[PDB]
Amino acid sequence: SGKAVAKEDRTTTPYMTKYERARILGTRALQISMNAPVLVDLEGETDPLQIAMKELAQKKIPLLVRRYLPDGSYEDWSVAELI
Amino acid sequence: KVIIAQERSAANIVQVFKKAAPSPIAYVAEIRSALERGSRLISSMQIKLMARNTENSGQTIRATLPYIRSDIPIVIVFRALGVVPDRDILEHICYDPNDFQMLEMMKPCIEEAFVIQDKDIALDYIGKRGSTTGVTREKRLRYAHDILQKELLPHITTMEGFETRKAFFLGYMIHRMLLCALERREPDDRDHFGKKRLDLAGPLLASLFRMLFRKMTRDVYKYMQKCVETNREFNLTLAVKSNIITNGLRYSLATGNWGDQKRSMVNRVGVSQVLNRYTFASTLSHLRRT
Amino acid sequence: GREGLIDTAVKTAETGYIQRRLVKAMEDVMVRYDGTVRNAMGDIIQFAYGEDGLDATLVEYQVFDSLRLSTKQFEKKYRIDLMEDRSLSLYMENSIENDSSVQDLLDEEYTQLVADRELLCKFIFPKGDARWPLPVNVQRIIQNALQIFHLEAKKPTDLLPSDIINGLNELIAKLTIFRGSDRITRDVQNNATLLFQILLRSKFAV
Amino acid sequence: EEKNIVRVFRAWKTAHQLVHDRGYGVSQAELDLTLDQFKAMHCGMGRNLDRTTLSFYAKPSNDSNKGTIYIEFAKEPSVGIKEMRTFVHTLGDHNHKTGILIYANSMTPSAAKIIATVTGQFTIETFQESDLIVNITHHELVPKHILLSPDEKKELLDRYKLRETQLPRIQLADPVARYLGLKRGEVVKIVRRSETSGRYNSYRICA
Amino acid sequence: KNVQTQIEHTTLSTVTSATEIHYDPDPQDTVIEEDKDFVEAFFAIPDEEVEENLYKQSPWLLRLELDRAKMLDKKLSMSDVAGKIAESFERDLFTIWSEDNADKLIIRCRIIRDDDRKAEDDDNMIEEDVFLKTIEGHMLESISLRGVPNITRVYMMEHKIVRQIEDGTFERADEWVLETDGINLTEAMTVEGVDATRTYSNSFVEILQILGIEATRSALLKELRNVIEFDGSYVNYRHLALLCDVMTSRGHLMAITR
């Protein structure tokens, strides 16, 4: 039973977690690998992931993270928000 | 294929071997000896002691006498050989003086025979094989005598008129026990080896051969019944199945079994390993394994 | 030889058996986004991240200078006064004040009120040991640090006693791990770093 | 010889001490009673012959909440319907929230149920002798637990958004439960002499 | 040593050789077998009640050789040894010991009754005996002396304990400590020593029953460190911490069997 949480009153840590980085980069990798709209000047890469990393560094990558709480509520974070 | 040795028991001991202390008993005297005459060797012994339950009673000793059935106090068996009268029974165990200590322990032992009390009852309290049979006395007595001549200390002698010989051994057995509870020596050591024997390709090919011939005399015996009835004529190489041990060794030596492909399921794994000719050196170290 | 030759035959299997035991009872647990470790069913087993709140893997046993010290020498390291002292003025360079008006004289005894409520407790908690594993090697961030900027005794401090004390208060309250406030929920945090804290008032006291 | 007499002097370091702790009011005089200061207040023929009126009462300071507790020994060994149900009217006469009755040794089943049954809101606890006659509270290994008002109880279930079940339980039969007199449902905060880093606070409920 | 020998099983461990059964008719029968006898005669001469409400009954003399092998290591008199027997058997037995001036130190223990009501449930015909051996089982198992039922032999080793000073410094107060050898506690802090604030054990089972539940967690943590540390061992307080909380997080001690 969800509940959703205020994009204004967020609780969790402002920084991006060891695991998340790993999941995001994993996620965009597949996306781009699947011919997708790449959101940063193509440096001239080949690797659907080494590219995603170019994105992450510039925090110019879509995808958001829903962090489920024990309650059942959640929070949404933007890659540009995170740290 | 190369047969490989084995190290089970020893037999003919003469072996303390105690235990403790779940506990139920307290001081055993395993013997598991048996001829030995050139194959056969099925049988055991073992006898208890107990010394728990400070409420029951005074530390009393018993016996088992395979292969049936329960526990049977000691005096009961002396009274079943030729020594019913007391005192004389203790003479076979200990020797006064004496040394009551070692003897005393008897008190509780004798009490178990305070009902024997001669030769009739003795053989009586032996009706429990078994699979439901008897009816009742006379028969029971016969079974008791049979046991005393095959089960009760099967080695020594299996004749008939030799029950006075097995009368001391028991005394000797239990002589050892007393030496340990009183703390007069130490429980024999099962580490030997020095006491265990290696069954090479001989005594091994014994117990098998025997376990395939006794079927011979059975498969043919049935043929006679069919012949004498409706048939007859007499006999002749008409039976004597050819494929009885010829094929009955191929797949018994070839594998680790001892009577395949019969029902003999869990029959100790060979002992039959293929040669292992990697390096000459090896070959040899294989013809010397156990 | 054939004993440690079978005692090596065991540790080869047994060791493995005992391993699985734990796993098969601890898979359950994990750290929830709330800053707490919980069961499969939600049944919570710890209110920190390991009582500490930190990742084992990033930690360096450290030492509390301020512990196994004689009160007599304690005072000769942290305490300061105007009583026939004023030896620091030789370092206040450049710029003394001098002493200006109150305030300073007052900050100096207030710092030690708490650096002192820390000397008594611990102990009252820790036996006698001193070496304990804390996050972030402080004893090192200062060296190297006196490598980066150098400056020897010859150069006295361009600082100000009214800064280093603010320095902390503003950057201990930046070390948060339980969020947030949410009043009273700031308590679990105030003392979920309390140990790490007494360090920062002992290696950075005035 | 008079060993079983001195052995009870310690039942007042395990009793008047058992108060706050809770929150009741006891005199700092009754906490610093030496070996003989105890025999002083109590006048016994000897020598021996002690008993008498060993067992008093006390008041709380938490104002409301109510009500009050009654410490009462025996001193009659083995108890005992002929000392139980008969020592409740007394407990209903001066009106108390609850009280204690001690014994040694053993207590009969009969006199254990026919009581906590019509007791209603009140309660019968719990201890005995030759058992908890030394405050375990004072032990290197035993951290001090402190009670939680029902208000504070609701705090946890918010700040940590939990269920009255999802918390660390405590069996009733725990000498520290019995000690503070926890009932099934209350919630006890304990401040662990952890490391930890720090002074980590754990919480527990009852079951 | 006051305490060293103030919390041990004790019981009938000094006798161990032992119990003898002599049949002596008249209350003035003996023999030996040694010396004694004289002491017994002196006890009877003082005829301070010999007759008593009853008379001369107790044809079941039983003797006890108390070894001076345990009379020195444990402060025990002879009037105590047999001074507490009749504190659990009424007057069914009459003990008569001797002074420490003896060379064997022996003590008698007779049995009188008849004409007693006798009975009940269970008859006894042949022959005044069994009922005896049974009594011994209780006698040798009860029980005077600071014998914490169950607590076997104890030891004492110097434990380098670190203390504080009014100075600031810490010091190594090499204090003595006893090392139990089995259950149990509880009646173990009731002792004069002792020490309640610090006594410890190896059975969590019990620590949960007699301390806290929180207490017992600390017990685990400690008892696991002592398993993997001696010597030179990869310790992390964190993971150790977690195993404990999992064990003591639902009240009872949840074991972790295969």
UniProtKB/Swiss-Prot annotation, chain A:
GO molecular function: DNA binding; DNA-directed RNA polymerase activity
Subcellular location per the Swiss-Prot or TrEMBL entry: Nucleus
Provenance organism: Schizosaccharomyces pombe (strain 972 / ATCC 24843) (Fission yeast)
Keyword Nucleus: yes
Assembly behavior: Component of the RNA polymerase I (Pol I), RNA polymerase II (Pol II) and RNA polymerase III (Pol III) complexes consisting of at least 14, 12 and 17 subunits, respectively.
Any GO BP: transcription by RNA polymerase I
Protein family per UniProt: Belongs to the archaeal Rpo6/eukaryotic RPB6 RNA polymerase subunit family.
Range of the intact protein held here: 60 to 142 of 142
Post-translational modification: Phosphorylated.
Keywords: DNA-directed RNA polymerase, Nucleus, Phosphoprotein, Transcription
Function: DNA-dependent RNA polymerases catalyze the transcription of DNA into RNA using the four ribonucleoside triphosphates as substrates. Common component of RNA polymerases I, II and III which synthesize ribosomal RNA precursors, mRNA precursors and many functional non-coding RNAs, and small RNAs, such as 5S rRNA and tRNAs, respectively. Pol II is the central component of the basal RNA polymerase II transcription machinery. Pols are composed of mobile elements that move relative to each other.
The UniProt record lists the keyword Nucleus: yes
Protein's recorded name: DNA-directed RNA polymerases I, II, and III subunit RPABC2
Gene Ontology cellular component terms for the protein in this record: cytosol; nucleus; RNA polymerase I complex; RNA polymerase II, core complex; RNA polymerase II, holoenzyme; RNA polymerase III complex
UniProtKB/Swiss-Prot annotation, chain B:
Further facts: The binding of ribonucleoside triphosphate to the RNA polymerase II transcribing complex probably involves a two-step mechanism. The initial binding seems to occur at the entry (E) site and involves a magnesium ion coordinated by three conserved aspartate residues of the two largest RNA Pol II subunits.
Top-rank lineage group of the source organism: Eukaryota
First and last residues shown, out of full length: 195 to 484 of 1210
Organism expressing this protein natively: Schizosaccharomyces pombe (strain 972 / ATCC 24843)
Cell compartment(s), UniProt: Nucleus
Record protein name field: DNA-directed RNA polymerase II subunit RPB2
SUBUNIT field: Component of the RNA polymerase II (Pol II) complex consisting of 12 subunits.
Role according to the record: DNA-dependent RNA polymerase catalyzes the transcription of DNA into RNA using the four ribonucleoside triphosphates as substrates. Second largest component of RNA polymerase II which synthesizes mRNA precursors and many functional non-coding RNAs. Proposed to contribute to the polymerase catalytic activity and forms the polymerase active center together with the largest subunit. Pol II is the central component of the basal RNA polymerase II transcription machinery. It is composed of mobile elements that move relative to each other.
Family in the record: Belongs to the RNA polymerase beta chain family.
Cysteines engaged in disulfide bonds, as pairs: none
Organism taxonomic ancestry: Eukaryota, Fungi, Dikarya, Ascomycota, Taphrinomycotina
UniProtKB/Swiss-Prot annotation, chain C:
Entry's localization field: Nucleus
Domain of life the protein comes from: Eukaryota
Post-translational modifications: The tandem 7 residues repeats in the C-terminal domain (CTD) can be highly phosphorylated. The phosphorylation activates Pol II. Phosphorylation occurs mainly at residues 'Ser-2' and 'Ser-5' of the heptapeptide repeat. The phosphorylation state is believed to result from the balanced action of site-specific CTD kinases and phosphatase, and a 'CTD code' that specifies the position of Pol II within the transcription cycle has been proposed.
Entry function: DNA-dependent RNA polymerase catalyzes the transcription of DNA into RNA using the four ribonucleoside triphosphates as substrates. Largest and catalytic component of RNA polymerase II which synthesizes mRNA precursors and many functional non-coding RNAs. Forms the polymerase active center together with the second largest subunit. Pol II is the central component of the basal RNA polymerase II transcription machinery. It is composed of mobile elements that move relative to each other.
Quaternary data: Component of the RNA polymerase II (Pol II) complex consisting of 12 subunits.
Domain notes: The C-terminal domain (CTD) serves as a platform for assembly of factors that regulate transcription initiation, elongation, termination and mRNA processing.
Family stated for the protein in its record: Belongs to the RNA polymerase beta' chain family.
UniProtKB/Swiss-Prot annotation, chain D:
Gene Ontology biological-process entries: transcription by RNA polymerase I; transcription by RNA polymerase II; transcription by RNA polymerase III; transcription elongation by RNA polymerase I; transcription initiation at RNA polymerase II promoter; tRNA transcription by RNA polymerase III
Superkingdom, taxonomy of origin: Eukaryota
Phosphoserine sites (modified residues): S149
Disulfide bond entries: none
Similarity remark: Belongs to the archaeal Rpo5/eukaryotic RPB5 RNA polymerase subunit family.
Function according to Swiss-Prot or TrEMBL: DNA-dependent RNA polymerase catalyzes the transcription of DNA into RNA using the four ribonucleoside triphosphates as substrates. Common component of RNA polymerases I, II and III which synthesize ribosomal RNA precursors, mRNA precursors and many functional non-coding RNAs, and small RNAs, such as 5S rRNA and tRNAs, respectively. Pol II is the central component of the basal RNA polymerase II transcription machinery. Pols are composed of mobile elements that move relative to each other.
Subunit structure: Component of the RNA polymerase I (Pol I), RNA polymerase II (Pol II) and RNA polymerase III (Pol III) complexes consisting of at least 14, 12 and 17 subunits, respectively.
Protein name as annotated: DNA-directed RNA polymerases I, II, and III subunit RPABC1
